[PDB]
Amino acid sequence: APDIPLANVKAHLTQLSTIAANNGGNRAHGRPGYKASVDYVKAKLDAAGYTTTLQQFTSGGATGYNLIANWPGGDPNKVLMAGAHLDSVSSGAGINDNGSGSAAVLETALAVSRAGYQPDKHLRFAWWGAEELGLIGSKFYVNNLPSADRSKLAGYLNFDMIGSPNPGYFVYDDDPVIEKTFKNYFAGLNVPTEIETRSDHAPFKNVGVPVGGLFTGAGYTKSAAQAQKWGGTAGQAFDRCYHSSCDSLSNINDTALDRNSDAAAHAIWTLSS
Numbered sequence: 001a002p003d004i005p006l007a008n009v010k011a012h013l014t015q016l017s018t019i020a021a022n023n024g025g026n027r028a029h030g031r032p033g034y035k036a037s038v039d040y041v042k043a044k045l046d047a048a049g050y051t052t053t054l055q056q057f058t059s060g061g062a063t064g065y066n067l068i069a070n071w072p073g074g075d076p077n078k079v080l081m082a083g084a085h086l087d088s089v090s091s092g093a094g095i096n097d098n099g100s101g102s103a104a105v106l107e108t109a110l111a112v113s114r115a116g117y118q119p120d121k122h123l124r125f126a127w128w129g130a131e132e133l134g135l136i137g138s139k140f141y142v143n144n145l146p147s148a149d150r151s152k153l154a155g156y157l158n159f160d161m162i163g164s165p166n167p168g169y170f171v172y173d174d175d176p177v178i179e180k181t182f183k184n185y186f187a188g189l190n191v192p193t194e195i196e197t198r199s200d201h202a203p204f205k206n207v208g209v210p211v212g213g214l215f216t217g218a219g220y221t222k223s224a225a226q227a228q229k230w231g232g233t234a235g236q237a238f239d240r241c242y243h244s245s246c247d248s249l250s251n252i253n254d255t256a257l258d259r260n261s262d263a264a265a266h267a268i269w270t271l272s273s
């Protein structure tokens with residue numbers, strides 16, 4: 001896999017921050033900052049050669065969108081998916097929650113094209129709408145994916161909050177092959193991980209698609225033991241600005257964002273061979 005350039009990921013976050021500022025301070029479902037987020041991500045993907053789909057739904061009286069990006073080629077009967085919700089809550093720009101996951105997934109999809117990669121499995125990336133309303137966009141996608149296409153899914157990888165300023169390194173304990181691929185990447189860095197103990201992998205998991213993912217923590221408090229193994233501040237939240245107006249460009253730990261973006265690409269390459 002390539003090394004995902006941290007600066008490229010950070011630059012997507014800067015664009016999402018500007019989009020929030022230009023649209024009432026947020027990127028929330030039913031508000032213009034969400035669709036403007038979608039348009040930015042879509043234009044990058046289209047220019048890199050993806051076949052993109054805007055999947056529209058209505059929730060709460062307002063139009064929502066999922067953005068689906070298929071990399072042409074690969075075995076149609078073995079599809080590997082990776083995704084991240086692209087909506088924020090309306091209190092702020094949602095840069096860690098979940099610009100961080102959205103930017104890592106986008107930069108990994110751009111890296112495929114830059115590398116001239118031809119994965120054996122077909123790759124499909126997704127940016128979900130309306131996750132903050134209760135997984136509405138990912139539930140819509142799974143509910144509208146015919147069973148014949150569901151059965152073609154080899155896995156779904158989810159990235160929701162991966163740049164927390166006081167981070168832990170959590171790996172979902174779901175499908176064993178996906179979990180081992182992420183833990184192998186962190187082992188090469190000599191960075192320990194813990195099992196993740198309510199995001200867009202749930203609708204996939206619940207219909208038997210193998211899932212996994214990465215998370216750096218939200219409102220819970222970092223323990224003494226976690227500060228000893230990962231650094232940071234014991235007794236403070238992993239993300240002190242969770243769902244807050246302060247979930248801004250300042251609310252990112254660059255090392256966590258870099259490690260989780262690189263791990264995302266590692267798993268996507270490994271699992272699509």
Ligand SMILES: N[C@@H](Cc1c[nH]c2ccccc12)C(=O)O
Pocket residue numbers: 097098131132160161196197198199200215218
């Ligand atoms: N889905 C949550 C974030 C979150 C909290 N705890 C998690 C555990 C795993 C994955 C995601 C989470 C949100 O968007 O605010």
Ligand SMILES: N[C@@H](Cc1c[nH]c2ccccc12)C(=O)O
Pocket residue numbers: 250252253254255
């Ligand atoms: N995100 C920076 C820390 C930081 C907070 N606010 C900043 C403003 C400018 C530059 C860096 C920062 C890091 O992870 O090291």
Ligand SMILES: [Ca+2]
Pocket residue numbers: 003004005006258259262
């Ligand atoms: Ca990197």
Ligand SMILES: [Zn+2]
Pocket residue numbers: 085097098131160161
């Ligand atoms: Zn989230």
Ligand SMILES: [Zn+2]
Pocket residue numbers: 089097132243
């Ligand atoms: Zn959230």
